[PDB]
Amino acid sequence: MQDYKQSLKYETFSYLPPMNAERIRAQIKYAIAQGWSPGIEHVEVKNSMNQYWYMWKLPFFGEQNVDNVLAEIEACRSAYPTHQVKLVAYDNYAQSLGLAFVVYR
Amino acid sequence: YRQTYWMPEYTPLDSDILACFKITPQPGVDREEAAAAVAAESSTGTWTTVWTDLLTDMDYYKGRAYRIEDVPGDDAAFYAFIAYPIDLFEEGSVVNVFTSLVGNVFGFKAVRGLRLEDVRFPLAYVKTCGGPPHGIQVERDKMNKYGRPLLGCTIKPKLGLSAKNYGRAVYECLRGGLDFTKDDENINSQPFMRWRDRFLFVQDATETAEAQTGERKGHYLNVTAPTPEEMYKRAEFAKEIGAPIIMHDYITGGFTANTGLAKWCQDNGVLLHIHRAMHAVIDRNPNHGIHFRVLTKILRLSGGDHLHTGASTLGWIDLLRESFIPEDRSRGIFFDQDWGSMPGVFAVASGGIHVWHMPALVNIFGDDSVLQFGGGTLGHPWGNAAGAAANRVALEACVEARNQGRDIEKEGKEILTAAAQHSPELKIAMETWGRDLARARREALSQQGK
Amino acid sequence: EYRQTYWMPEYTPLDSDILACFKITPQPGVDREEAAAAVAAESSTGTWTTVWTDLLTDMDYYKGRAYRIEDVPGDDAAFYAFIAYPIDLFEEGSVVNVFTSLVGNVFGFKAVRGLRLEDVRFPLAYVKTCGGPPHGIQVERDKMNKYGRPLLGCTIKPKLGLSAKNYGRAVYECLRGGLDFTKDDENINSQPFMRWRDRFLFVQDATETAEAQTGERKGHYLNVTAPTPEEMYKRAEFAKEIGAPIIMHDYITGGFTANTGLAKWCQDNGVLLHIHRAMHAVIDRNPNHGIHFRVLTKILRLSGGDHLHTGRASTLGWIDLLRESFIPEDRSRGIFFDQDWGSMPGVFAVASGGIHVWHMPALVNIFGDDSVLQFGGGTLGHPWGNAAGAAANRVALEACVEARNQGRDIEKEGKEILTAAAQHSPELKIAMETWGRDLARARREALSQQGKA
Amino acid sequence: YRQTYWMPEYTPLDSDILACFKITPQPGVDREEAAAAVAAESSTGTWTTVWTDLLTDMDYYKGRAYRIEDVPGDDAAFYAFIAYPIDLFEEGSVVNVFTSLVGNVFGFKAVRGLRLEDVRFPLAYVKTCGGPPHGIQVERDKMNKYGRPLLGCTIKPKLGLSAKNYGRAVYECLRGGLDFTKDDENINSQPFMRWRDRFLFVQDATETAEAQTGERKGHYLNVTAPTPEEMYKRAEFAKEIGAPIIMHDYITGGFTANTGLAKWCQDNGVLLHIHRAMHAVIDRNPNHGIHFRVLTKILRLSGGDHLHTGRASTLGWIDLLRESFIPEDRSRGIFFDQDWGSMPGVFAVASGGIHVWHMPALVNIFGDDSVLQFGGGTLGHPWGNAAGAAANRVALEACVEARNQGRDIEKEGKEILTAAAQHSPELKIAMETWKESGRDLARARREALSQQGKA
Amino acid sequence: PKLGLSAKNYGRAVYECLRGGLDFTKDDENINSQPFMRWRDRFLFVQDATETAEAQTGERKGHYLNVTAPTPEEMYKRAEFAKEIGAPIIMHDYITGGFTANTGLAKWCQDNGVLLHIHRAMHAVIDRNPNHGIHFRVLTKILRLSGGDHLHTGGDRASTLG
């Protein structure tokens, strides 16, 4: 038997190894392909359970350039290097997030 | 019967309830007398006419058999389509619609077997029912969970566990990465585990595991009870102690009780997981009974936020989850079902699934589902937390694959083995064992109406 | 595999155990001991698996276990499994939990072709935890002041389309004619054409007017079946607020939780409770897959009602189950365990469904005094009105009872008795033109002198 | 009386309530007729058979004497065994069972003395009563306490102490190592210490000692009251303020009140400590009255989480209080098998003039599932309530560590305590201060019935 | 948009507004309890937004939660829940809800320390034609007596200042 090692988590994909730049990209490509509008959020580590993170800029509506998003993710991580950073994909039909996940813990 | 109740030229009204009955008649019966008999026996109860009938508009107050179809196969069975004016029923009462359709006709001597396949609930009647207390999208917002199916574990043994030992198994599961744990259908308030003590320790387990994972955690505390007063008392105590979700056995506890619990849940912001205990008594015999898709529509009107849903299968999952479900005989869906804005219900998969089923389950059910692992979690050789992590890793890697474009069911073993190179818990675990249609309709209607 | 843990042919049931009898039709590959064992596990501790959490508990106490197998007379495909459950597996006073536990999982078991719950043995120690009938036969008779005959009812038709006041007019005419009760149909709740509060006012008005004009207590089964417990109780309270003696509930379609609660409310408030078995044929018709009505009979007695509709051999089997204090085993009638009720009272058997004056001799001869005889068209369909049909039935019931009391064979002598009464009754004469306890008492005597012996 | 109420061939049914009366008859009466009289006087009490009897089933609705035995070592007295059908009583009412059995017959002039020794409550009647609000195992889980008897102190003087000073004694005790402190049975709401003020300061003390020790603390706040409304008001305030445990005097407050309070304790998660004040009025005289083991059973059914249990008879009623099944055993005054089923058991409480030197015999007689309550044995310590509490707590643990090691802790008493003082100055000073299977049977039978059933 | 926002997306706009520097946000007069945003869900996520922006600005924040409702039972239920969750201010459409509901709501609000923002929805059906109806200064006096802590007041300047 091996002993399970407990640590904090951050919802979807956080039981997987972190994401480089390539695996992030396939997630933004999925979202744009589902018609969802990508958005970027950040908040201090101790507040990641908050319902409302700080919004970086606005959602990228109608945006179809993965590299445009990827760069803004990088731009947010530079503005707040200690904050967590999250990627969300707004679904307008369901009034839900088709996807969300943390890119920098 | 046929004189009054067989109305082949009648085109149903958008406000009528419609029922599709699969009739298996005795050898010497004409199909139209049987269809008219089932319309009459499920609406007026009789074929005759006594003097009190003539005090009423007999032409309006009756069910109409308005079409008969063949069954591919059983040449001794036919589909009978029946219309019921919306005015035969009390509003806001699945109990009264249900009683009226199935309370009497199923003992009809003149058929060898009667099977209720589907029921068209008109949008004018849907709007009188309370519906899900929250529904898929509100629940994801409350629990802050997007992008994946949710994970759950039914605690076992159903029997013999103290409240505190029971809480232990809950804690070890929730801290492992599962979103929910679940009281069993039969767990109510037994001598070995009184409900108040269980609720307290489960909630302790839930808050300890939540604080150690930073993910919101739930456990479906079963409030199925001997009386409505006990049911409500148990639901109230879960709210008082902070529990986010409760459970009810909607068929065995009953439709009157469940409709009431659903409305209390919406009034109180408590999520409501529904168990379909005993559905199989009713829905398994293909020649006599009520099909589980009827039971599925009943529950969405009555009220649930989750529902256990086990071709036909993917039909009733759409019915449970989407805003509009078009008729599709290849899935046993005999009528268009419009739900309007009434929210959809999480589809719950359970029964003997483990990590190897993960790629298919993500593939079949999609994101808006709860996947409940009984022994698939507890039975892990390294304990409950390790098996929860294994199931959570498998689920998340199957979802990352699907998003990346891969055929998860065919590349299943490959997806799993690759992610197990980063998770010992997963690798050892392997060794041990509709929407687009509904939205296409909304856009089309938004532009030109009819 | 289940056999090793759940098949215990050496077990003799404790007297405190819940026993069940399933008719199992196994799939062709599976042998009887393993089918019985799976049924027993899937209806108690729903797995064959041993996980670590099980070792935290006494797995030997906390299980159902199959303890006997039997052939089914004249059916090789099927067999009986008799299964015992420790009283501790169930919440007390909760037929909802014993029901769920017994029938809420096992019926989907794919290794069986057909599963049918035939009988359930409720031990005296569990019966004493349930409320039972709010009154029962003898108390209801006292409250209503009716002895020496079956009670008489009529169900108002049409079930649809009548306003509250028009409905009360058919009720008034029936009651003033000599019927003890009238009846809301199962589907009568609160539909747009007859809102429930209006129906209750006019029915009660008809009830008081007919009682004044006859000098005999009258009632009408007011249906409180409702979308929610709140609506159910509100309707029940109003029927008490206005003075109605009896209400009515659809215990299966409203549900076991609501019904137990209603029965409790009734006993606390002095209102009789007439029980309708709507939907039951969905469950108990198919003799290979479902729950036999005699099981549904026992759950109602425990949940609570003062009347239950009961509908050859099995039928009077479950009537005895419904009314008598003790019912011994009898496979000729489908009774697979002795059922001891103790002091929990019996419930009126209600006969309905396409019956008229001519069925009276057989009905009195079969159901006896402690029954209600419900007449649909058999009262509404009379050619002089409801009052005359009510009178015709009342006269023909009473003639059969006087004839029975006198030693006659009312079934063999049916035509003569009704004709001889037809002479003094124009209503009955034209209506003729248009259309067990000994055992329970013996066992109580013997147990009084000898006790356990 | 004899011809209708003496039934020597009747075998009791399992649903029957059984009683054992020790009868000391007057010189000129035979044993048959006296048994039949006690049965009649405790069930139908008929002095003249009248016409209304003939409206009923007289053979069923009556107590019946069915056996008589000698009292070993007493030729003047005999045992009468009586069966009562379960229908004679209201379900879930020890009030009704008690009143029926003992409400009329003890005044029977034709007997010199009458003593109710034991009552067989059949399972089918046990299932109608609420039982302990929690019971030993639930309570241990709620208080997170395992592997040792629990330890309490009863605050003295019973009289004269302000609410705040009373909380001070409580605080000093709890912080030194006791789990529980206790209101005296007389402490209700007197002028010198109103109950609301007592509850507030005790809770303050409870929380302060709990924070300073890291172990859950409790204090049995006595809610014995003039009226049910006052009783329930006091219980509600203890819950409101966070108090884990309350106390009732179930005999003097009475069974109706106690039964309702136990129902309320289960519904509200409050533990319930039961004091047996007045029992010696009823149960001391071996010839006339009600034996304490009956009063033990009545309390388990009525409801309590602890019960004061105060030789062979003593060990007998502890079993009746704690275990799931207790076999007949005349040597320990147990006259019938008593099956409790799943009805939980109750902590037995030992109090009354005990100090550290009793600790080995107490751990050994009572075992783990017991509370050891020290009155003056904690407060009388020359260093205060905290040191006295610590001494008792060290002595308790060392006796438990000795016994778990296999030692004959009662024989090796003065040695285990002496090796313990070598690390606790507080236990040493206290030693110069003052001078000097029931479980296994119950398990054996549940396993037996689990494999074989009726066998 | 007044229409089509879920409770949570609605709260997001409130949070981003409040943290900007605004003291209050506001339900629209048409926002009651519509199917795309049930009132209880809205109140919870608004109050979350409110507290989160308040904590990040160190300035007291409010959102006029709209308790306009089909019956006075519903109005009072929604008002109490706002107090129950801590919201400092609610909102009522005094003319379309009505003066009986509003005077009662004003009285409840004073008994409970909850501020009351008033919306003059429908006033122009009544007060626009200069030859028939009721001038708005009349509706202004009514509201003050009925009760409100805020009222929407805007014309030709002279009357408006009046």
UniProtKB/Swiss-Prot annotation, chain A:
InterPro entries: RuBisCO_ssu, RuBisCO_ssu_dom, RuBisCO_ssu_sf
Name the record gives this protein: Ribulose bisphosphate carboxylase small subunit
Presence of the UniProt keyword NAD in the record: no
GO biological process per UniProt: reductive pentose-phosphate cycle
Species the sequence originates in: Halothiobacillus neapolitanus (strain ATCC 23641 / c2)
Effect of disrupting the coding gene: A double ccbL-ccbS deletion does not grow in air, grows well with 5% CO(2), a high-CO(2) requiring phenotype (hcr) and forms empty but otherwise normal appearing carboxysomes. Required for growth in ambient air.
Family: Belongs to the RuBisCO small chain family.
Single GO molecular function: ribulose-bisphosphate carboxylase activity
Induction summary: Produced when grown in air or in air supplemented with 5% CO(2). Part of the ccbL-ccbS operon.
From Swiss-Prot, chain D:
Cofactor note: Binds 1 Mg(2+) ion per subunit.
Keywords of this entry: Bacterial microcompartment, Calvin cycle, Carbon dioxide fixation, Carboxysome, Lyase, Magnesium, Metal-binding, Monooxygenase, Oxidoreductase
Catalytic activity, as annotated: 2 (2R)-3-phosphoglycerate + 2 H(+) = D-ribulose 1,5-bisphosphate + CO2 + H2O; D-ribulose 1,5-bisphosphate + O2 = 2-phosphoglycolate + (2R)-3-phosphoglycerate + 2 H(+)
Primary site of residence: other
GO terms under cellular component: carboxysome
Regions crossing the membrane: none
GO biological process, one term: reductive pentose-phosphate cycle
Name the UniProt record assigns to this protein: Ribulose bisphosphate carboxylase large chain
Organism: Halothiobacillus neapolitanus (strain ATCC 23641 / c2) (Thiobacillus neapolitanus)
